[PDB]
Amino acid sequence: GNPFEGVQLWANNYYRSEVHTLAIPQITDPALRAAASAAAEVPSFLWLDTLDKTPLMEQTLADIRTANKNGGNYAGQFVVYDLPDRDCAALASNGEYSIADGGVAKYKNYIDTIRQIVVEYSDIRTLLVIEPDSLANLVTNLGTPKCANAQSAYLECINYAVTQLNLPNVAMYLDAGHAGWLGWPANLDPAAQLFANVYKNASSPRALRGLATNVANYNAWSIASPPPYTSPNPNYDEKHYIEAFAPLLRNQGFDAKFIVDTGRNGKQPTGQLEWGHWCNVKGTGFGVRPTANTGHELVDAFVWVKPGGESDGTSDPSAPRFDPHCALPDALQPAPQAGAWFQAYFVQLLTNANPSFL
Template sequence: MKVTAASVAALAAGAVAAPSNTTPRSPSKAAAACSSAVTLDASTNVFKKYKLHANTFYREEVNKAVEQITDATLKAQAAKVADVGSFLWLDNIANIAKFDPAVEDLPCEDILGLVIYDLPGRDCAAKASNGELKYNELDRYKTEYIDPIVAKIKANPNSAFALLIEPDSLPNLVTNADLSTCQESKTAYEEGVAYALKSLNLPNVVMYVDAGHGGWLGWDANLKPGAEELAKVYKNAGSPKQVRGYATNIAGWNAWDEEPGEFSDASDAKYNSCQNEKTYVTKFSAALKTAGFPNHAIVDTGRNAVTGLREEWGDWCNVKGAGFGVRPTADTGLELADAFVWGKPGGESDGTSDESATRYDSFCGKPDAYKPSPEAGEWNQAYFLDLLKNAKPQF
């Protein structure tokens, strides 16, 4: 990297795993499924027609959290979080079992957001959310992970799906090429993402490939290489028509349109003109268009209500003082941004603060990280309450 801070920011890769619980949960209500097959036009913004589904798994997590709250006002506010649409993380082979009960709870007017997240050598630049597959197990990724998901989507043609493809993968290849773990994973990442895009190119699916955030690929030196990396994999997949664009700020903390940006006063700010996600979407979309990749974005606003909390761009783990942000909506004020979404379910940990744990990552022990925190994906009640209290707008 030409810019030291950019390589540090690239370590924002980790700890976005979903909970490991695979127990099917009862639908919260009877869903009125579509009466005929769904066809999504990926040349349009489908979030203008469909509402992001408040999936049954996050709903139950929130409902359990509500039961533990004694303050009446806070309890009422917390209950409303269960109705917010968020993406469901299929973060390992076992968690594909979450698919069926989630679809059972899906009305026709909603779209189910799914995170496809189990690449071989996953999160090569972080430890907190390393995956189950080794870097040389690409065949398992294809046959035991992607293929079963494809089969389930094909078995549900009357439902709409928005897929967020492999957080942190391709951005890591752009900025962390010096790490041996990322070098080992390069082939599996590129071939795996291409296989996922090609295989999941189904009529009732719209796909967004993860592209980090403004503090990662937004550095001036990273914009063009980042766009070219996404375009390379997309073209290798045959330029699937159901790919709409990319996802930004997933499990992140960056403000949408704050001016000046959170790190605008930093000594190296002159090397990063993308000081907020709105600027990043504008600039990265232009680079993607040049590279030949669909250039519309979805932006995670699930935890970005409060800024000025981090010491550096790259601090990604359970940031103290964070708050729930803008609820999912297609009203972003920018044509290139299809929707604000909740990608990371607020309350699920980014990674453990236990230094003796195998998956401990030093970023989870930094001064701006909340402590104590459990393993990635496990529920942290105290942190959930902070997100609720600091929410903007408030519930």
């Protein structure tokens, strides 16, 4: 049943080209250059954060089809991340579509385009994270006007995604935030009802395998001592969050299994001053390498979802779409625009990696 079992994970050429064309020519030390080349071979998700990235999904699946007709057993890894009024509680968003300006119809076309590409590659197992930073806002952030207004659109758009991508070669994991968002005990029951109702309102799609946690975040999977910025949450790591949340979803008829983003959680505690500081956090490392061998039946895989070295946001307050979280003193600076290559952050992650690359 675990879609990560029986397959390898494809390491995509987009990330490899950032490492090889942008990063390695800036590194003089031979050991760090070799470490960088190895990091580019660790398979991370490719983000489809605009419609103009959908050709990248098709090219990636064409590369996988060639590899698999030549003996590979690779699965593709993609993030679906283009809701209208995206990131409704954030101080800045890069989403291209607006609910008030045709955004729901534009989302429909974006999902329609992805469905035809996944059908075009119905021979290729396709592992999707659906919409980071979306439904979790409807549990805690309804007091933010943009999120109160976006409820209907987010729920209809997510229903369209999980129904239209319900294909025999797909496994989807809905983003469900992280322990410091939905793992607080007061958020668990409302979160479980919301996410189980999404599953049931979509007619319990076979491809909707479960939920993704820690995406673009830094929490430990398991740590013996709670980091101080987690107090007083008893669910201070992803393992305790998932162990508390999974049986509540199952109680409501969604027997969800999980994947956990371990791409930036290898150094613990992090440099965070507060748990809600998410941008370009200092003091982090690459974490556990992608695997289906998690030791935990709730957890299908540890994965690298956010790609290390791609910025979370610009720190220039005069730049477009500046988010003040990216200028906090626990955010590494200067940082380029979201998604752009951030060399000093890539070096940070490589040097602090656990397991090590050096």
